[PDB]
Amino acid sequence: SKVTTVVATPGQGPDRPQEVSYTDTKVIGNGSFGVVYQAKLCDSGELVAIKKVLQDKRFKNRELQIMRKLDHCNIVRLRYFFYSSKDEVYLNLVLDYVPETVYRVARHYSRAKQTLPVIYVKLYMYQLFRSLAYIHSFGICHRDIKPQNLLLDPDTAVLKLCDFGSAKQLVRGEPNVSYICSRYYRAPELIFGATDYTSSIDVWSAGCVLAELLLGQPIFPGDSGVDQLVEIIKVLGTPTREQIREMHPWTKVFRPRTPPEAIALCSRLLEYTPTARLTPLEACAHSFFDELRDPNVKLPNGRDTPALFNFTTQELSSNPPLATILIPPHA
Ligand SMILES: C[C@H]1CN(c2ccncc2NC(=O)c2ccnn3cc(-c4ccccc4)nc23)CCO1
Numbered sequence: 001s002k003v004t005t006v007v008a009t010p011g012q013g014p015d016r017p018q019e020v021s022y023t024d025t026k027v028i029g030n031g032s033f034g035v036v037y038q039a040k041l042c043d044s045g046e047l048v049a050i051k052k053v054l055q056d057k058r059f060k061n062r063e064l065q066i067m068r069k070l071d072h073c074n075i076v077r078l079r080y081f082f083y084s085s086k087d088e089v090y091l092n093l094v095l096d097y098v099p100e101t102v103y104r105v106a107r108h109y110s111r112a113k114q115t116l117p118v119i120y121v122k123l124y125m126y127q128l129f130r131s132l133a134y135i136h137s138f139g140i141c142h143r144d145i146k147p148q149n150l151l152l153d154p155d156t157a158v159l160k161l162c163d164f165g166s167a168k169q170l171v172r173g174e175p176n177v178s179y180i181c182s183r184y185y186r187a188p189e190l191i192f193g194a195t196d197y198t199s200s201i202d203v204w205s206a207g208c209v210l211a212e213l214l215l216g217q218p219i220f221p222g223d224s225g226v227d228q229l230v231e232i233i234k235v236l237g238t239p240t241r242e243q244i245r246e247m248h249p250w251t252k253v254f255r256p257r258t259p260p261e262a263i264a265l266c267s268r269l270l271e272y273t274p275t276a277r278l279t280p281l282e283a284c285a286h287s288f289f290d291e292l293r294d295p296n297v298k299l300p301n302g303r304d305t306p307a308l309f310n311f312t313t314q315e316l317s318s319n320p321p322l323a324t325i326l327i328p329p330h331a
Contacts (some may be wrong), residue, residue, distance in 0.1 A: 003042060008094060011068055011078030020080055020094070022048065033165055034090075038097060047097035048079060053165075055083065055091040063164045064091060066140060072315075073307055074131040076151060076162040098151030098160050102209065105154070106147060110216050118259060119291070119300065120157065121213045124150065126289045126308065127159035128206055130315070132280035135161075136199045137317050141170045143180040145205030147212070157299050158306045170199060184208060184218040188232055188239070189247035189274060191225040200274040203283070207269025214254050214262055219270075236272060243272040261288040281318050285325045295330040 001023050008020040021042040029036035034053040041048055055061060067078040080094040102124060109116050128150060135142060142149075143166040151160045166180045175195040181187070187204035189197050211219035219235070222228035233239070235248050250267050251260075265288045268278045278286070291297060297305055309331040316323055 006082045008080035008082040010080055012071060049095045049097045051093040051095065052090050055089045061091050063167065064093065066164050066167050072131060072134045074127045074160055076160045098153055100152040100154050101148055102150035102152060103147035105152060106213060115216050116213055117300065122289055122292055123157045123305065124159045125210050126284060126292055128161065129280040129283045131161040132202050132206065133284065133318065134315050136280055137314050139169045140167055141199045142167050142202050144182060145202050145209065146182045146185045147209055156306055181205065184221055188229065188272060191229055192247060194247060198274055200277045203269055203277045203280065207266055210269065211266050214258055236270065239272045246273045279318055281322055285322050293328040
């Protein structure tokens with residue numbers, strides 16, 4: 001077994017490097033992002049993911065700057081970072097390992113001609129909304145919400161948002177690129193080429209993930225923006241002049257046994273008007289998640305549900321009175 005020893009800087013806290021040794025290094029992902037590895041830390045025995053990207057000499061890495069300041073139970077944790085080396089330098093992000101993704105779990109169910117039990121749809125969606133409530137409180141927009149970027153530990157039912165390669169602090173009056181976000185999950189303002197969009201593009205993407213988990217397939221597919229806009233229009237109806245300036249019965253969209261609270265939540269996330277969409281914190285508070293607030297709720301495997309109510313002042317800052325719903329009496 002090959003052991004690699006590096007001098008890495010801890011993610012959170014002041015810049016004080018340490019020797020870090022890891023082994024059992026294997027490639028687990030390859031794409032436009034770069035390469036993701038799996039490895040075992042020699043000291044603790046803990047599994048880690050290592051995202052390796054090409055580092056520009058000219059500037060500081062935006063993903064690293066964002067990740068160093070994030071601390072949330074539903075966001076993948078940056079343990080360390082280090083630089084490595086023809087004649088080019090790479091930035092390596094040592095993250096907490098999470099074994100599965102919502103993409104892979106949902107695909108197991110789709111191929112088996114079935115849908116993910118609604119208890120999981122609530123757990124995953126609720127935890128995704130918490131992660132968005134947290135990043136959005138600092139003005140940070142993920143800009144790439146999709147099932148592959150939603151990590152899962154299937155045994156504990158914990159969801160962790162990953163991939164901050166497109167994330168950016170959105171400042172009012174500053175223009176932003178419209179070519180971020182993956183096909184199927186782009187908000188209609190991004191399809192229309194808006195550069196003045198807000199963090200609500202993340203809420204639309206999350207609404208696309210929710211509808212997909214309920215349906216067993218993407219709600220707005222299409223290989224072009226015009227095809228995707230046709231699928232959006234089939235469900236939401238034709239956008240008014242006011243709606244276009246700002247950027248079908250929903251019950252007939254899903255299978256008959258679909259909970260009406262789930263359908264009501266989709267209609268409030270998937271709206272043409274960016275300001276009409278729910279905020280992540282308001283989505284957390286929706287009646288679709290009431291089952292998670294029940295003191296007797298348990299996972300299908302018999303275990304207790306993960307931490308769902310440990311809200312901080314920062315997390316609640318968008319609407320502090322929502323704490324009366326969000327933190328139930330038993331919590
Ligand atoms: C294909 C991968 C791409 N991947 C990413 C794309 C861009 N930047 C980062 C990541 N990954 C991560 O930040 C990440 C952090 C922690 N644990 N972890 C496990 C796995 C994983 C990798 C392969 C198969 C299953 C799981 N990926 C991660 C997201 C998942 O799907």
